[PDB]
Design a protein around this ligand. Sequence first.
Ligand SMILES: [Cl-]
Ligand SMILES: [Cl-]
Ligand SMILES: [Cl-]
Ligand SMILES: [Cl-]
Lengths: 210, 210, 210, 210
Amino acid sequence: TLQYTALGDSLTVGVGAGLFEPGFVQRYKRKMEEDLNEEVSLIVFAKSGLETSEILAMLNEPFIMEQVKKADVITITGCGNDLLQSLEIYEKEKDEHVFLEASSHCQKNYSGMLEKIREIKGEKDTRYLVRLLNLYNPFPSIELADKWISGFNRHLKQLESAPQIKVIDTYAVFKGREKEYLSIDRVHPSSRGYEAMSEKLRAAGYGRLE
Amino acid sequence: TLQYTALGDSLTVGVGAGLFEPGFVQRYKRKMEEDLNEEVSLIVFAKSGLETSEILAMLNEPFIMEQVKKADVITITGCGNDLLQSLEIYEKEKDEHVFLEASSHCQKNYSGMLEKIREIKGEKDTRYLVRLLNLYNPFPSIELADKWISGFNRHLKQLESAPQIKVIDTYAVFKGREKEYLSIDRVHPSSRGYEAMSEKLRAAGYGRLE
Amino acid sequence: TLQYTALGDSLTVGVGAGLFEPGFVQRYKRKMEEDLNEEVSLIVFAKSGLETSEILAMLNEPFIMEQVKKADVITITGCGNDLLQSLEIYEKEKDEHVFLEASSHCQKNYSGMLEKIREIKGEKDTRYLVRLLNLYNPFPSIELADKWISGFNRHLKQLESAPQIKVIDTYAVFKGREKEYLSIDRVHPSSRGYEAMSEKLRAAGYGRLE
Amino acid sequence: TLQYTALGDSLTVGVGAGLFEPGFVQRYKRKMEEDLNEEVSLIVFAKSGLETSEILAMLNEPFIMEQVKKADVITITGCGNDLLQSLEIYEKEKDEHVFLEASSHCQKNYSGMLEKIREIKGEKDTRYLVRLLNLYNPFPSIELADKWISGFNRHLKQLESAPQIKVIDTYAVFKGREKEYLSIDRVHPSSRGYEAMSEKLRAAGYGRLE
Ligand SMILES: [Cl-]
Ligand SMILES: [Cl-]
Ligand SMILES: [Cl-]
Ligand SMILES: [Cl-]
């Protein structure tokens, strides 16, 4: 029996697809049982607007680190709402320089996240799997958003240690397919976009699990 | 690998124990694994304020019907918020019938969702298990609250068909220990209360599954 | 010194205006000190996607009901995210009949809310103020959303007991002014829309506070 | 009516005490009212993962500068998440300098935001009050964590100019009682810890305001 532990923000919750409609987490689970030919047990820890610094603190909670210790695959979303609130400050004040440090403060919390996972798993374990999803651009017309999200994904890929730690290219999934993959709120993906996300996670492979 | 689906309101969510702290559904999942020596996959469809009629309407959702059909164990919570609404309506109108009519709707929806669960599974799989929890009285000093909830619970026990279908006596778990088993809002359970609820579920046995 | 206690969901938080940019709560506070010519102390209890059933439970928390007992003005937002998730289920399944009971289950939680406020305030108090904001339509093109939101506001106005309890016509504030008052997410209001909201709350008057 | 503004990270938010449960800033507000016999208006600008450089950049925001200029009491928290990031970086690289460089940036930003607060108010109003809290050691069994935080605290005490500016010894409050003063995540305080923090602030006095 495989163990999938999913963490993140409004994307891991499934916001945009509707209440109880399967998001990317549930669909990536289905593609796991089909590929690896084994039943997988899922558990989710997510909240809209959940910060990355909070996740690094959560991993000390006994019930959470228990799920991480036995987790065969781990997915992490985050920082999507940090750039949104930053753009909204730019939308009101028209200043390109805002106190956002999404690239600076989120990326450093990510590397500390991965290290805490390593401590819980134990250095002897080489079998587990971690998959970080970068950010898509929901506002292609706004050039400043495309500059911020591209800069965050450029610095996020540096944390990849294939094939255990892989950064999923969520940006390329949504590039040129915004209106088809986004919900009516246009900031969270549709049920179609969550399906394409799960396919990109499947494209990353499963390392030594096979 | 066993599949355990859980439906209901804030209790199935785990409100009161703290964010990401395990509620009763995952403490019951761990004990289920311990008592049957088999890993368990958990799926949860729950939201605060989800009344019993909505929970019945969920069973026609294609994705929810998928997880209910595969479920070896099903837990259902509900009608707790109707008591809070009725106590506030009684405070203004002093009509003792307002809750009996609302309690009559819950008992009808419980019987409705029960009839749909067997319509979903059919006659081949009678090995399924349903454990629905009755209502506890969070206000023991209010006799009308105790009388109202006691009447709903004796009418709810009519639905029991042991060992396949069992009605969990949540009222007996909480009676006398509302100070330590309820959370800060005096209506939702604490981690102690959720732990005691999961103990009552494990005590009910597992029927044909063991 | 006046006391303003604000409750609600993502609107009371100020989502859409940016991080720390003043939403309608902060701007309605400013217009209170200008009109009533007295300093007002503000305290907020809000969370994105916060259910109305949770608010009715929150009012039993000792720290919350203390702020309500001394509150001169009280604002309540809610249920805006319940219709959003319902439309999103309709967007995927194309069924007009969904398990949403926003009009049915949210409105009944509202009347129980107002009664609990009355119990905390005491029946002798006639001076306090409560202001409920109805829902605006962020999707004017979608006709089903305009039908649902209009039906919710029609049943919500029935709870008005002027001038203590007033239902703010948030719908008319945004009607014909969507792109100007909405944030880039198009589901939460811009800093302009939060300003117009505060002006509508000011239009409701202040009852006996004057 | 006194105006009390509060800036910082998750501590100023109140993370760990439970949702909507009072953190240290509102327990300190109640004691401030009790010790000075005057109502207090509270404004809070805080978010999880808000590092010290961002808090300094906030002081140029027009709305934040408004509340800081009117503030009779200002509390600042920060640099707590840098310790968590540094401990994870040290776990991989074993460089003892990684935190001293990060601790040097916090002490610089604290001095920076202090210099801006007087630039915001000027020379007319020297009756303002600033209480900044140092870091506690949530991991007492790690000597490197205790040594790192002790060094940051003695360098932080250089900024004290009593009674106007005071550095609150949060370390002494938590030392020896990390089991009961920390929350479930072993890093954020509990309601007991937040209560003890507010007691330490009231013990510091109020300078020229009393
Ligand atoms: Cl298997
Ligand atoms: Cl509920
Ligand atoms: Cl005054
Ligand atoms: Cl933080």
